[PDB]
Symmetry: D2
Subunit: 387 residues, 4 copies
């Protein structure tokens, strides 16, 4: 019934709550956590109490039953403070996503119910050292032996890997190398305390240092037949489904980071003065902030559209990819320009802009790299012109 760019009073309150938290509780300690690299437990507990965590969990499982548009709205406020921290919080939504859209009443009740009861964490296990962008190439095995599957393999770059209470695991169940991807993998929910799960050490990355990233080995892990999501073989579609519903929020985190660098650079441009004039008075630096503004705004509407698409019951693969490709890219651009506007100071650890550049980079790599995001769009676009 007409276009609208106005939030509901409910969404307005969520954003307020998320914003207050990011500024008063996240920003002050963001650097601390980035230097040390320690899991931000206090901030995660707090976000959990304010209800800015596990917003997709259904109401009948003690959750808020919020949609994607809502999750994006909160995520961007959270990223503004620190994407290293928000990635941890978001790891939960991603790891629990495949259950929200495909698990049954009993699975949802058990694995989603515990998340609402106490600040538990969960992860998403799909990537492997040999296959990331190419999901169809993951080799972690899952042998149907009796009333349990025996999982065997090595997963890599898992967010919340060594902090998860349980995992969503994508494994190959069909041993025939000619088996279609849409019938060869199975989704399992495996409790982290199962004997045979060897959690590796914390990986030292360039940015998002406080986020927990690890590799895991699954040496003859036994999973009950009840933890299979839809059935043997349905794993691929559940994975690709979770991604579609999550890309808008990953696009939202990047916009938050971009917005942070824009605010930082602008505030400095108003304080610094060279060649007798304020930085903001040099036509070049004003064009820079101008273009930086255009980018954050455009990227924002990108995910707002993509999020709306999913919430309206429409297929959003196309829009969500535009959002992820665009937002991820401009986040990186704005981060670099932010440190540039800050001169020697921006390259220094005493300033916040330097860290954003480091954090920005993964927005072009995880969640489907910029290259696969363009493949998707080109695919959803061209198909419109065929028959």
């Amino acid at each position: 019934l007409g276009f609208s760019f106005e939030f509901t009073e409910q969404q307005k309150e969520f954003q307020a709550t998320a914003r207050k938290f990011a500024r008063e509780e996240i920003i002050p300690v963001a650097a601390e956590y980035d230097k040390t690299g320690e899991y931000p437990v206090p901030l995660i507990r707090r976000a959990w109490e304010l209800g800015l965590m596990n917003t997709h969990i259904p109401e009948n499982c003690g959750g808020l039953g919020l949609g994607t548009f809502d999750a994006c709205l909160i995520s961007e406020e959270l990223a503004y403070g620190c994407t290293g921290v928000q990635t941890a919080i978001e790891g939960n939504s991603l790891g629990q996503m495949p259950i929200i859209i495909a698990g049954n009443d009993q699975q949802k009740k058990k694995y989603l119910g515990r998340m609402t009861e106490e600040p538990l964490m969960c992860a998403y296990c799909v990537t492997e050292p040999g296959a990331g962008s190419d999901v169809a190439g993951i080799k972690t095995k899952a042998e149907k032996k009796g009333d349990e599957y025996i999982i065997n393999g090595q997963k890599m770059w898992i967010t919340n890997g060594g902090k998860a209470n349980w995992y969503f695991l994508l494994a190959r169940s069909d041993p025939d190398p000619k088996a279609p991807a849409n019938k060869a993998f199975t989704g399992f929910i495996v409790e982290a305390d199962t004997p045979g799960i060897q959690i590796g050490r914390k990986e030292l990355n360039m940015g998002q240092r406080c986020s927990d990233t690890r590799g895991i080995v699954f040496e003859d892990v036994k999973v009950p037949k009840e933890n299979v999501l839809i059935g043997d073989g349905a794993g691929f579609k559940v994975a690709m489904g979770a991604f579609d519903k999550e890309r808008p929020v990953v696009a939202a985190g990047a916009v938050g980071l971009a917005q942070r660098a824009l605010d930082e650079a602008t505030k400095y441009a108003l304080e610094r003065k060279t060649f007798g004039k304020l930085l903001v008075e040099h036509q070049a630096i004003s064009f820079m902030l101008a273009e930086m503004a255009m980018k954050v705004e455009l990227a924002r509407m990108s995910y707002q559209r993509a999020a709306w698409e999913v919430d309206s019951g429409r297929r959003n693969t196309y829009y969500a990819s535009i959002a992820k490709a665009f937002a991820g890219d401009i986040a990186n651009q704005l981060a670099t320009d932010a440190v540039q506007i800050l001169g020697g100071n921006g390259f220094n650890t005493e300033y916040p802009v330097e860290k954003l550049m480091r954090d920005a980079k993964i927005y072009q790599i995880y969640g489907g790299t910029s290259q696969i995001q363009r493949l998707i769009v080109a695919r959803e676009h061209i198909d419109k012109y065929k028959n």
Copy 2:
């Protein structure tokens, strides 16, 4: 409620009409009109009687009483067929805008009222050989002489110049050089058949060759005091506001040209075959096609935002300039990439793309060049950090 990216049933119906028209009536003749540079009188008459023109004219004066959002929607379809014809049609909305926003009852009934009676044209006269972006630097003057104003000066690049029934004229009334912009100009309605007016020849340009662009000389043009819009000195304000309402629409025209270039490039990539596979099979071209869809999609959302903003009673200055700046630029990008994908044929005059590349260019020039758009966004952005 919250966000919505859905048209109303009446908007979908406008879109359908404009689409059918551009598809069946404009596209077929677009090439001939660009070649001959002949004013598309027939197409303008059809659009007029289809109700796809003079959409802002209030219903109390015979118009439809539509808003900017609706104008944008119709305009993107018209531009898809030909931006030359669309520009001709948009000149009217630009000429009538100062009257719709600042005219009194008697002025609207008289000057708008007849646009409803016949397919008449009008123009927006403010640019000059010495001034375009710097509106405050125009030198055409108006001397109060009894019950008349005697205008003296020359305007340049007036779209629908020697085709208008009447004009909107911005002229300087305060002779004092150091007088402020907000009180030195006056906006008049000048009937075409007034004696001192001398229309120039058709200006031959590179793009939108069938639109009537030309300069005009006013040598002791007497204008009734009745014809001043708000009053002596209120001219600058009326012009700056007219630009705000019309910018999202000129941006909408840039998206139309862009979508045309995309359709053409895509249709050809699904048919031309190089190195044993369709162009769409070569990842480079697929990536090319991807970013093209990406750009146009984000551009469309930017003009929709700027249009919604104003209809809701907001100062849309910030969103309108982002729209016009972005859309103006992506239109040129898509246009050049479209001919590129068509190779040697793309450069040939018998193919629809070269004309798109030529038309696109003014989108960064008129209605506020790409530079002054960034100038505005910077201005609008910095204020929010000053206090």
Copy 3:
């Protein structure tokens, strides 16, 4: 032995000759030939006598013996005035290259010599309506029936195609659809007079409108066994080698057009004033002219190096393709920025810049489009890493 960026006295002379011809004779008439499209016969003749045309022909064949470097510094000076004229004149060298790098004395003074006696033109008939970038996709058949070769096929986009005394024709002789490039095409030298040949009409293009571009059908044309170049299955090596000699030159013409673009804009920026000051005194404009100067500077050095390789006796395919890709692109970027700097005037036909924008486009298509250049560089690059 030691880097040197200086020309030899002889070269410095050639440059000043081509320059005066360009700026005193070509420039005052470039506009007219663009508007009419008619072949600049006079300009081509005047250039012949000055020695600017057919520079590569050997001293023994009456020619001057100029190397590639010299051809480049001459082409750039000509193209500065008009890429249209420069292209027709350049069609000669291109059509001669195959006979120069792979012909025998007899063939040499038969074909090059005449070219020394009269201002005759030649063409390089390689591309076809169905195959442009994919040389191996060439379908023009050539069968050896006794002491001769009967040839049937069609060409498309041949410069000097209907003004050529003799042509260079590449055609497949090995019917076997799996005949390697290597051993599947034969290069000939077929004079325009041989019955069976038929020049199509003149193609109207968006730019370099005075240049002669037409298609040629070869409907049962016989070529004497002697007018074959190096033999059977020799044709492919020849064309690639020719290309390889000319890419630097097309890159030179492109750099020529860009210099003209940067000159016009800079001069306009030093006269036009907006908001009190000259255009140049606005940072966004100075920064524009600066990057326009950078782009051109780098492009010039790129072609000079590509030219040096071939002359130094070294292969140049890597630097060649780096040179044409960069040069062809920047030429387009400069041309459009120049139009922008001139504002409304730049978009008008009474101003020089507009033509440059229409001309520049082919510098990204003919002589190996921007995509295959990227493909050639990539392969030349990757190659030196594996083993």
Copy 4:
């Protein structure tokens, strides 16, 4: 006379020496020094004995008395191994550039002589917390007290400051602010152990972390008369001269980093397989690599040109600025793309590319930011038309 793109045999030697050293001694340890931020003394001392360190010191002072071109050649190689080490090594040559181009032989033998005897380091003190780019805005005072000057001020971001034996210091003598830049500053040479000098704590930056970077306070530091550079008041053109002479070697550094990023990414691309192909076989990846190559090759030529010009006895301002702006820009474009190509591994500390991304940023800042370089290029450009 004649263009030449080939080093002399001597230069080839230097290249090989700097190459073997960087790739066999710097590379294997650059990772450690990066993490630890420890001054690479072993590496610096070794460079010193290899004869790659004070390459500009005139023979009569024990030095090799090499020119800029040779310095660029050597620097690009040291940088390939690591720009943190290279910077410390480069800090000396920058710091002794004024003495070289302004010192009287008595000062020369004393200061440039030490360097020839022991690995002595030096620094270039010009930037201060209040100004870096706006050089003429420095506030460190120099006060004449007979045959000596008393300095008071504070510098910031000094390379090798805290490790330098002596400092080249630019301070403002004339207190009359209405005094021109060309007669307001005086350059000095000061023993690093003079009372009043308070070296600050090492700064923790994002890039070239083993490179030493500190601030310094001059609290009543006494400087003898004979330690002034051309005369009192000539210090502004002396600093500006050194800049023009060093800029190309800063560009060479960037290019070194770009080659590293290029090789590092091409090698990975030749082994990493996704979707059953090597990354190199995915057209979008090879196109990426082709453009990475293009940028490096051009950036190399720009610094060679700039370096030649200076060694040719002519002003290189225009080309030096074209070189530093371009090289610094693309070095970052390659650094980021190198990370992209290695994907998840690229963002991880276990791989080389990440460090390159953190190092590359400074090249757009120090040695004159990307903004000021363009001001210079534009300045030199419009000037060629001004007359």
